[PDB]
Subunit: 482 residues, 3 copies
Amino acid sequence: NSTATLCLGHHAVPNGTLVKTITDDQIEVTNATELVQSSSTGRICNSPHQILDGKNCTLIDALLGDPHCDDFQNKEWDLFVERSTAYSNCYPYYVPDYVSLRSLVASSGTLEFTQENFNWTGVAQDGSSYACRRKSVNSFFSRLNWLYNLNYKYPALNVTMPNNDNFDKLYIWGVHHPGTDKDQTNLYIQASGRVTVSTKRSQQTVIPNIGSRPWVRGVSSIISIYWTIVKPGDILLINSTGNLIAPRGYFKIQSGKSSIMRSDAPIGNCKSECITPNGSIPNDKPFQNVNRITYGVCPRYVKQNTLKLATGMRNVPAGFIENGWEGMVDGWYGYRHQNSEGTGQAADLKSTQAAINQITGKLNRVIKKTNEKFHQIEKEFSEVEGRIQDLEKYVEDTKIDLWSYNAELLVALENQHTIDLTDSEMNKLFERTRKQLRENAEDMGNGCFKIYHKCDNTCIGSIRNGTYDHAVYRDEALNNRF
Amino acid sequence: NSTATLCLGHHAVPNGTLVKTITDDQIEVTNATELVQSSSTGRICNSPHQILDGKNCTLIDALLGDPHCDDFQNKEWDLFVERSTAYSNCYPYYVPDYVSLRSLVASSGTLEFTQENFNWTGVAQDGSSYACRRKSVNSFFSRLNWLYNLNYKYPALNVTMPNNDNFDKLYIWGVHHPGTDKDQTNLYIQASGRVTVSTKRSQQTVIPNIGSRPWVRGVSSIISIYWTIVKPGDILLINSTGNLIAPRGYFKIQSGKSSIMRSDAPIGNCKSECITPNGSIPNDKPFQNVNRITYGVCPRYVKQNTLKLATGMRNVPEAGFIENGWEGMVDGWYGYRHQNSEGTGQAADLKSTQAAINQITGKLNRVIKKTNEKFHQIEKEFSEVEGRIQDLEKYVEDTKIDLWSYNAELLVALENQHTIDLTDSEMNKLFERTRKQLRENAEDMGNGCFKIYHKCDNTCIGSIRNGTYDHAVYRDEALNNRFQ
Amino acid sequence: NSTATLCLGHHAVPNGTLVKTITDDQIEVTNATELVQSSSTGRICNSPHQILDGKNCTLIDALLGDPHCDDFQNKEWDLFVERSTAYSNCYPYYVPDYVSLRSLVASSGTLEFTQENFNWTGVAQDGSSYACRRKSVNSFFSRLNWLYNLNYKYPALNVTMPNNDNFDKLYIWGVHHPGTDKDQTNLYIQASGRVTVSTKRSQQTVIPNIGSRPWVRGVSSIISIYWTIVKPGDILLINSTGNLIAPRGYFKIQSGKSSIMRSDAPIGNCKSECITPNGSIPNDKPFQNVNRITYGVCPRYVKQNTLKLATGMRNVPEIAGFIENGWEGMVDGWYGYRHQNSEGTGQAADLKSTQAAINQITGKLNRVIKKTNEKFHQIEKEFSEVEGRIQDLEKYVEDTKIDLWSYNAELLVALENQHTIDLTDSEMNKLFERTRKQLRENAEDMGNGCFKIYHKCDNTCIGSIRNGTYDHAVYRDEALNNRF
Ligand SMILES: *[C@@H]1O[C@H](CO)[C@@H](O[C@@H]2O[C@H](CO)[C@@H](O[C@@H]3O[C@H](CO)[C@@H](O)[C@H](O)[C@@H]3O)[C@H](O)[C@H]2NC(C)=O)[C@H](O)[C@H]1NC(C)=O
Ligand SMILES: *[C@@H]1O[C@H](CO)[C@@H](O[C@@H]2O[C@H](CO)[C@@H](O[C@@H]3O[C@H](CO)[C@@H](O)[C@H](O)[C@@H]3O)[C@H](O)[C@H]2NC(C)=O)[C@H](O)[C@H]1NC(C)=O
Ligand SMILES: *[C@@H]1O[C@H](CO)[C@@H](O[C@@H]2O[C@H](CO)[C@@H](O[C@@H]3O[C@H](CO)[C@@H](O)[C@H](O)[C@@H]3O)[C@H](O)[C@H]2NC(C)=O)[C@H](O)[C@H]1NC(C)=O
Ligand SMILES: *[C@@H]1O[C@H](CO)[C@@H](O[C@@H]2O[C@H](CO)[C@@H](O)[C@H](O)[C@H]2NC(C)=O)[C@H](O)[C@H]1NC(C)=O
Ligand SMILES: *[C@@H]1O[C@H](CO)[C@@H](O[C@@H]2O[C@H](CO)[C@@H](O)[C@H](O)[C@H]2NC(C)=O)[C@H](O)[C@H]1NC(C)=O
Ligand SMILES: *[C@@H]1O[C@H](CO)[C@@H](O[C@@H]2O[C@H](CO)[C@@H](O)[C@H](O)[C@H]2NC(C)=O)[C@H](O)[C@H]1NC(C)=O
Ligand SMILES: *[C@@H]1O[C@H](CO)[C@@H](O[C@@H]2O[C@H](CO)[C@@H](O)[C@H](O)[C@H]2NC(C)=O)[C@H](O)[C@H]1NC(C)=O
Ligand SMILES: *[C@@H]1O[C@H](CO)[C@@H](O)[C@H](O)[C@H]1NC(C)=O
Ligand SMILES: *[C@@H]1O[C@H](CO)[C@@H](O)[C@H](O)[C@H]1NC(C)=O
Ligand SMILES: *[C@@H]1O[C@H](CO)[C@@H](O)[C@H](O)[C@H]1NC(C)=O
Ligand SMILES: *[C@@H]1O[C@H](CO)[C@@H](O)[C@H](O)[C@H]1NC(C)=O
Ligand SMILES: *[C@@H]1O[C@H](CO)[C@@H](O)[C@H](O)[C@H]1NC(C)=O
Ligand SMILES: *[C@@H]1O[C@H](CO)[C@@H](O)[C@H](O)[C@H]1NC(C)=O
Ligand SMILES: *[C@@H]1O[C@H](CO)[C@@H](O)[C@H](O)[C@H]1NC(C)=O
Ligand SMILES: *[C@@H]1O[C@H](CO)[C@@H](O)[C@H](O)[C@H]1NC(C)=O
């Protein structure tokens, strides 16, 4: 009755979370947060990025001018979305270096086309095919010009086109490979054509190949597609004696943050910085497990499906040496007392705020939203290729393993640090109380002090308030101790 | 009067090991372990991976059907081992994009061949050569069909072969480059041949080169090798007016964990998950220094040859831990020494010993386990100058190794620092728990020992070590001795 | 005043530096150092690397022998510097795989040329052009030999050149593409030429392409450039029926630490291990923000422009101990005592704790990251032409590398600074505890980092505490009388 008990403690919860540290494989803490984004809504948000739904059209088909891709003329994009249902419906073609043409056009982000008055005197223009009907009429790629004989004559073409602008020009052109020699000589009078497209810095020559081919859309022939970039002040020169699928002009080729993505996710009316083929994902967490293919401001892809970051002290469901206090809801640390006036509880705001202030924004010190990716490498492959594809796969797998390691070590280190800093605040609160009490109390060993003098609620409050004067009670307290 | 001294201490060893921390360049600990695997047995274990010893055969020669590689027909592998002694002994050839063909066949992991009934009516088949003898008679690559004129005629070939299966087909074919014009017109009647192999998605045209070549195995000619992959529902279409080295069928091209490795190490009868060109290596350690070229579940290649991970506390060799550690303590990491009315004694503390040990066991397995399972990767050694693509392959690999070497360096320093800190922490916690027990009955002598101001025999000493010491029993006696 | 006050404290400075830790975005410390090199002199030091200023000549032009590059014949280099003002002034050409040829020659580091006597009987040699004037006379590339018909005849060339040396030979050769068909038949007699260059391990065939070209230096034609490497004991074989731009010999091709760099920085007379396009930079710091393109022993490129590494304790602006405040005015140590007794107040530094903290901070980062970054010929990292796939990969690899090293640098500085704060806070607490153990029952903790010593304790007595020789038993009777 002539003494008092003051216990120092911390809070506890009944439903703790296990996290991982350097010290413990699993340790239960009061609170944690997930660092790996692992789910997507399934929709690609049309804000803030300019999304272009390719629908049934690939970018190359929209580039060449497949009639069912006419709506894409001169359109621009931040992200072009190619659907797996896309198909070709014009004259059969193939693109040597399809991958690079697709990449650089996708990164350019525009299909702005400008016609140029090539002088094709001597030959017939605007060749059409039943295999490429546009609005029920035989037609051809909108951006290409199928040249053929004019009155049984195909004179040698030698056409020039300077680049007198301040920008690079992208020229798409082709070479026709007839199925038979009867086709070859009927279209182009010479028994074999030849196309040479050149600039002051390049030369590209194609010899057409007359030969049977597997029928595609009623046609036994095919077109090879090539591209040429003309720098400012340079000159495009097209020299041909047959089989030339001529350009009608140039595409602007820009540099910027545009790219292309293969996805079947629908485009929704929402706003999201990060786009994956699985759909848009939130970018609050530093890491994501949804897809290695991302566009925008995105969490970094890691192999882990979950990484829990401790946001509270160790959960331990007498003072803090024995146990935590589930009943303390207004603070992380606090006091419990037993004196002449009964029992009471009060939280310590100083130590609680110190622990919280260290834990808030903990992760914003090492990992921020510094991962803004636009056009990158391909990370999914449908064809066997070998060397270049091996390297692309190895680079991406090397990157992911390294960030997965970084993510693992970071969470373990930070969680070790969250435990230690919260353990530290508890000991500091205990030491502040001991130094206040001086020779008026003894450490009972369980996180509680035995105060050797009568100490009513105001006296206990003075200790919690930091205004306890040991000199006032030292005479009374030293008398009871010894 | 009658008092007792109780000292808190930790163990020490005479033969400590130097490790590195964040704090110290080198600090001696009681025990440490190596994290870098630096030696190999010298043998490639034939388990658990399916090893195919190429012996004197490269993979491409086994693919084409070099007669001395006939034993490799239709064989499969997880790891194909190419020896530096391999040689070619058939018709002289070269493969444009040899590297990619070798890679994709190696990654497929099988040489399963399927013959197909190509209709070569109009030409002679099964051309043979003195440069490619099989069973001591003129022959040719087993998987290729040397077509040439039939009775002074080589009609233009137009042969089709649809892919009506569920898988991609790999077709290997060739073009013959005769040494002279006499050779060209005698073999193929036309003055210049032409080979066009096409699919619905591809076209490959080759113009043969009539011209002399360095004499190789009695031949001044050569064959160019090409490959074509035919997707399901697609069709192989072959058009030739001479010089076609025709396919006899297709190879299955599978996807899986198969690869190829250049090594001269022998194949032994053992079990080992990790294979390097130097031989199999253990994969218990997280890092290895043997070879950046690995196959299987492997430690990560680092530039360091040794990384010692502390598995024990700081070593302070030979009362109380403030002064020194106790080599004489062999049954625990922490413990008590006392001097009382009954003499002197020593006893270890199980709680603090177990706390430190449990925190250290599996300490590195909390950050890096054997999640490094690699199979077919990029090439990492090169015998020829190539330029751009090889520059990139080298830069990629050197970037990876530097980053992992940095990771390994920082990890060991961090782990060792934390191992030091946690073991030192257990010592201070043990000393403090003892102080809390003694209350006003003892005083800190400053050297890790308490002066207990009352008679405290071995049972009393044991009660302190066991946590059952009641200070109130002796408080009256102790306070009388402390204060005069 | 029959008592004394002994305060334990640490120093403080008026001009602290903000650093970043795991705990705080900004915390002021007594001292810090910059880890990111962010500035350049603007000049490339001509030592210790052998620098070759390309002037107005690219490496490929110096290789082929453009007349205004004649001064570069047979020169060697550690680093070739291409200026953006370089230009070509000979016959118009293009190099298929220009990047690779530039790369492999730059890595070889020499233009040593050795003439060889090819037998070009039957054709005319040393064709010259108005497009390639040398000393105001029509001329040609110094290292190439333009062959054409000799009196209306171009016989088939079949010229051999064995490599009977112990080193590899690099052969540069070309194929001429006339602008018109009549040009083709006037120069060479055949309507179409053919060039086949072969060795025992390679074959290269070129079919010339007749077609108009943009007029360049009076010429509507062009030359394709190719290269061939002939291993020892191998043989170069050149077979042509027209359009061959023949070699005059071979280049020695070495392996070493040579590279090429695009820069407009001037070359100075100084010494610097690290070269960037912006100029030489010091390599004392582990990181640099100047340029991802480096040559030599260089700091690792990071995206950060500054990373400050704490080299001192927390700065706490200013008797009272360390609990309340730090001591501005302590200039001979990091930690120390302030005392107040009968003779007044005094201050003295503690050398043990000061040296302990300092020894732990010096070279702290060299324990984890040294100058293990020595790079020479690497990949290209800036691009003037659109290329697509391969350039996509080179950009992605470098961007991946920089982000990973930028992450490492950010985490390393935050970790190291947190540990520097913690180790210095610890040294302060250890000194305070060492003093508490010395005083025994003669003093009490006042809570502000100070002890109230309950006995008369002049300066010699205080010095004994600082010196570690204070005997508490001497004053215990006097002190206990005052406490209780
Ligand atoms: C070389 O051989 C190929 C393969 O046998 C020949 O191609 C075949 O040519 C015929 C007639 O041109 C094609 O017939 C057509 O088939 C389509 C299929 O739907 C049908 O709708 C048409 O009414 C027509 O009957 C046949 O499809 C085609 N086969 C392939 C695989 O493309 C080629 O003609 C030969 N070259 C010659 C004879 O010069
Ligand atoms: C173009 O020039 C090359 C090289 O000068 C000629 O190749 C050489 O051809 C002769 C045969 O005429 C080869 O000689 C033979 O050598 C074998 C084994 O070495 C020997 O057993 C025979 O009895 C015969 O003497 C010689 O090896 C070969 N040299 C090389 C480097 O391949 C080639 O014939 C010329 N082309 C034409 C169309 O003349
Ligand atoms: C195919 O068409 C092109 C384009 O017209 C022809 O190229 C042009 O050829 C003329 C005559 O050689 C070049 O003119 C020259 O210009 C220089 C300086 O400007 C001047 O000093 C000369 O006296 C002459 O006027 C013209 O530059 C050139 N155009 C280009 C873009 O290079 C080419 O000749 C034609 N080829 C055939 C086989 O018809
Ligand atoms: C396979 O391709 C060849 C290559 O063109 C075809 O041969 C051509 O046939 C016509 C018929 O008069 C000739 O004018 C061409 O010159 C031939 N080419 C050559 C190189 O001589 C061949 O016809 C094709 N396949 C079939 C079945 O005919
Ligand atoms: C490039 O254009 C030139 C100029 O029109 C072509 O040259 C003519 O070719 C025809 C047919 O071969 C000849 O009858 C003329 O005499 C040529 N004229 C001149 C001025 O040379 C040339 O054929 C074209 N080249 C290509 C590859 O198409
Ligand atoms: C602040 O820290 C820097 C770096 O730790 C100190 O600079 C070092 O000073 C010593 C002098 O003993 C030199 O030998 C080192 O070469 C210096 N290092 C560097 C990187 O400059 C500096 O002394 C500290 N400043 C103060 C006032 O203590
Ligand atoms: C390779 O060199 C041989 C000569 O060594 C060339 O063959 C001669 O070619 C001409 C015309 O093509 C014929 O008149 C001769 O009869 C040929 N000689 C022999 C021995 O065949 C051949 O053209 C060259 N090949 C090339 C340059 O591709
Ligand atoms: C627990 O941590 C999360 C993550 O920061 C936070 O949102 C929440 O407010 C914290 N407190 C709780 C759940 O009481
Ligand atoms: C186009 O070029 C031909 C070439 O013969 C020329 O006759 C004609 O005048 C040119 N026409 C125009 C509109 O430039
Ligand atoms: C996202 O899509 C990829 C392939 O499209 C799939 O492998 C992965 O499991 C998907 N993840 C989620 C969370 O939908
Ligand atoms: C040293 O540490 C290793 C690895 O943890 C352990 O296997 C070994 O038993 C230890 N040795 C001693 C003497 O403690
Ligand atoms: C092969 O095809 C040819 C086509 O010319 C046909 O005449 C012949 O009868 C066929 N024979 C066989 C055995 O397939
Ligand atoms: C392993 O073999 C490779 C290739 O011969 C060699 O570079 C490396 O030094 C060897 N290392 C060991 C540890 O055997
Ligand atoms: C050079 O070539 C001519 C004609 O091919 C030949 O007669 C002569 O012997 C050759 N000389 C040498 C040294 O090879
Ligand atoms: C170095 O030059 C590059 C341009 O090549 C520029 O982007 C960079 O900011 C420069 N850095 C410095 C430190 O001057």
